[PDB]
Write a protein that binds this ligand. Structure first.
Ligand SMILES: Cc1ccc(S(=O)(=O)N2CCC[C@@H]2C(=O)O)cc1
Ligand SMILES: Cc1ccc(S(=O)(=O)N2CCC[C@@H]2C(=O)O)cc1
Ligand SMILES: Cc1ccc(S(=O)(=O)N2CCC[C@@H]2C(=O)O)cc1
Ligand SMILES: Cc1ccc(S(=O)(=O)N2CCC[C@@H]2C(=O)O)cc1
Lengths: 264, 264
């Protein structure tokens, strides 16, 4: 998409040489922001084929509050496999914080229900937020949240959402992070009887791995195609009752898929 | 400053009519980002005179972890007075989360010491974060954090910092929020033997109150002046040992002060 390609070129033009925790080098910038008007079309990268099967199941699993990967394994979704222990456990990652953030007094806070409540009854609120950044639980997590916190906003009948992503692999992860939150905006909007507004993406350490440089050059030689359209085939009674089959992407005509090797 | 005035004009040009919790109307945009290269000069607004006395004491008080306003009252700083109860208490706002975030198992997490530790021993980390957004404590706070979370980053000997501000009064609060975090970047950098990099400001609901419209027009008719220079007169042994008198702003030559009335 135009904003996505502009971000790739920016990291190439001004990223600084920086290694990750593993020791794999990257080019990196700090601080970036992009906006996707969801009424312009579903923001799924067209300059390389991006599959959404895993992303849809992942979002449903996050909304359920589950951090054990057996649901993902029931559907042969293996994107969390490398972090899961023998029992399939990941510790209190994303879903556990969204639905059951543990407090010092023994409560489990349901941030998704809180924000739906706020969107329906106090849409002008400036604190319609979900955070996965639960400082006391980070040590138990298989990994600290990369998409760490997000805020909703309502204006003129439209639902917008801003995500703060502390760390971003532009080539491999970003396309999927955008699609995931854009899907969630559509689902929340449907549940609140609102139209879709903007998805605002904000990045912290935003990088390209040095072994993705050829892939990045290839993708930058391709012209974005028209954005597809998300269709929600049914309207569930709540945000927790969406099913995989409810979603259909229409008119997606991407350039060919580009693989991304990763060091271990 | 140029970025600040551009943001004012943007809210005027495209903000949407939106009320706050009180019922005072605002013009509002959602999602904005600005960058201040701290090597270009200390980012204190010059198009209106901005005082930093309260801001400096406030930052020292935040770093101490104190949420009772008696220290502020010892120095005749009254900016938190309207939120404090009879004993001067505010609940577990900013400082309490920065220094002693309470966990479900009874620990109190010192996020400032954690991040200093990370900056000195693992500067490439992509998780050098402080969050004040402690979901289980929001109800006890006099008010939910507006400057809710911030991340540090190190590249080429320079310390940068990105703040996510969920709600921003562009006229009254923003000038001060920028200066506060810019001061903290200088102090953290000094303690880590690093040069200052960028302060990246990211906003969520970013607005102008409708009773600040004349003030905004007046300020937009003024040309920014050269930025001042921050001088730290002494190097304390730690980030908790800074004193009011350690800081001096040099070369600040602002246009006249502009008052901001507020409804109650
Ligand atoms: C009916 C049900 C849903 C989801 C879960 S869970 O384990 O995914 N999680 C989400 C809410 C609290 C619960 C738990 O961690 O115990 C348990 C039961
Ligand atoms: C196909 C695919 C989807 C999503 C991601 S990811 O990097 O955004 N994500 C999924 C696994 C854990 C990781 C994360 O959220 O940190 C990677 C690959
Ligand atoms: C020596 C000292 C510093 C600061 C405080 S405090 O009340 O401001 N606060 C900060 C760290 C934990 C402590 C408390 O809330 O008890 C108490 C004692
Ligand atoms: C002179 C002045 C400084 C700072 C602020 S503020 O809006 O950024 N701040 C200080 C009091 C509580 C409020 C806040 O951080 O939410 C307002 C006025």
């Amino acid at each position: 998409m135009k904003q996505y390609l502009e971000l790739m070129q920016k990291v190439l033009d001004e990223g600084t040489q920086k290694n990750d925790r593993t020791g794999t080098g990257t080019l990196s910038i700090f601080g970036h922001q992009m906006r996707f008007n969801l009424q312009d079309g579903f923001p799924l990268v067209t300059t390389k084929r991006c599959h959404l099967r895993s992303i849809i199941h992942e979002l449903l699993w996050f909304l359920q509050g589950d951090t054990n990967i057996a649901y993902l394994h029931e559907n042969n979704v293996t994107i969390w496999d490398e972090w899961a222990d023998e029992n399939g456990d990941l510790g209190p990652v994303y879903g556990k914080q969204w639905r059951a953030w543990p407090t010092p007094d023994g409560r489990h806070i349901d941030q998704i229900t809180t924000v739906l409540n706020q969107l329906k009854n106090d849409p002008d609120s400036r604190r319609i937020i979900v955070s996965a950044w639960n400082v006391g639980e980070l040590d138990k997590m298989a990994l600290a949240p990369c998409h760490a916190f997000f805020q909703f906003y309502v204006a003129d009948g439209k639902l917008s959402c801003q995500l703060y992503q502390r760390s971003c692999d532009v080539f491999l992860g970003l396309p999927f992070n955008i699609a995931s939150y854009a899907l969630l905006v559509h689902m929340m909007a449907q549940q609140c009887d609102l139209e879709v507004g903007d998805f605002v993406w904000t990045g912290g350490d935003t990088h390209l791995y040095s072994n993705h440089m050829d892939q990045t050059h290839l993708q930058l030689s391709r012209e974005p195609r028209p954005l597809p359209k998300l269709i929600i085939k049914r309207k569930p009674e709540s945000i927790f009752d969406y099913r995989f089959e409810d979603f259909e992407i229409e008119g997606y005509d991407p350039h060919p898929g580009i693989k991304a090797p990763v060091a271990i």
